[PDB]
Amino acid sequence: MTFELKRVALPNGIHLDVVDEGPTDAPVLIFLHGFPESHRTWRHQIRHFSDRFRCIAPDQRGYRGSSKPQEVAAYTPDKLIGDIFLLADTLGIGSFTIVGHDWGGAIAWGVALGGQHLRVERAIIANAPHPAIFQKLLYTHPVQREASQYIRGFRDPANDALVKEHGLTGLLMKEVKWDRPSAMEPEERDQLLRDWQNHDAAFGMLNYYRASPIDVPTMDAPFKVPAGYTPPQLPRLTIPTLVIWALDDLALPPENLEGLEEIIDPLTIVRVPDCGHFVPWEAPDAVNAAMEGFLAGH
């Protein structure tokens, strides 16, 4: 399966290749993939909703044919969040629902929190931790700290020799702490294996972790918030928000949902039992069902 991509030049000097399907003046859903995927992550939802919604899905910075600057700092969270507002600007989209999975969901939380009521009318987040919650969990909760040890591997510049020899695939093969995808259609797998052979993309994709200010301690460090840690002041999220959470995601255990109710209103949580990390395509019918109910005009 293939979507037509268009190249969108942005005023920060980046271009993004993007899916743009559906009626031009329909309500907009902007879909953000995570690592190590592509605009294809939300394929099932894009095809499901593009009869009624304008569906935008970029290959984000660092991915596939989009700009792949090699410097780590080109991937700081502000830049990744900024790319989405600039993409909406360039396409003439005043307000949209932001939809994100994994890194796309982390970016989506930022987009929603910053842009709510001005640019962002609803948020849909699937298996991506909330920035008010995640850093604290890494400090306090062994389940989460253990779950996130792969990030330390992805950050280790001693692994770059392996990426240069074997593409991203070599590091994914080597990094046993990384939670691997479940069974996917052969055509989808083939595309990713081809994508992962591009050196510049492999590093751009890894740079999300390398540029992130998130602190993932070793399992040796005390399970307490450091004395000098100041929790970023965030606003509450006061746009309609759907959080979808596959319960067998080994990277992002369900503890990530604790505390969401206090900081989001109106919040809907849809737990997906017996499903791993890649929920948009591992459980597309549950995801489509959740989105249908949530997006309904009543």
Residue numbers in the entry: 1 to 298
Authors' account:
Epoxide hydrolases (EHs, EC 3.3.2.9) are enzymes that catalyze the in vivo hydrolysis of an epoxide ring to the corresponding vicinal diols. Two novel EH enzymes of the α/β fold class have been identified from metagenomic samples from diverse locations in Russia and China. The nucleophile Asp102 in Sibe-EH (Asp101 in CH65-EH), is complemented by His277 and Asp249 (His270 and Asp241) to form a catalytic triad.
The ORF found in the Russian metagenome (Sibe-eh) is 891 nt long and encodes for a protein (Sibe-EH) of 297 amino acids that has 30% identity with the CH65-EH protein sequence. Sibe-EH is monomeric in the crystal structure and in solution which is similar to many other bacterial EHs and plant, such as potato, EHs. All residues of Sibe-EH plus one His residue belonging to the C-terminal His tag have been modeled into the electron density. The amino acids Pro36 and Pro266 are in the cis- conformation in the Sibe-EH structure. The Sibe-EH was active on all tested substrates resulting in conversions > 99% for substrates (2), (5), and (6), around 90% for substrates (3) and (4), and around 40% for substrate (1). Sibe-EH displayed an optimum temperature at 30°C and retained more than 40% of activity at 40°C, while CH65-EH showed the highest activity at temperatures around 50°C and retained more than 60% of activity at 70°C. The substrate epoxide oxygen binds to the side chain hydroxyls of Tyr150 and Tyr209 in Sibe-EH, and its likely position is marked by a conserved water molecule interacting with these residues. In the case of CH65-EH and Sibe-EH the entrance to the active site cavity as seen in B. megaterium EH is totally obstructed by the adjacent monomer in the CH65-EH dimer and by a very different conformation in Sibe-EH in the region of residues 159–180. The high ee observed for the meso-epoxide in the Sibe-EH reaction can be explained by the formation of favorable protein-ligand hydrophobic interactions when the ligand is attacked at the (S)-carbon to release the (R, R) product.
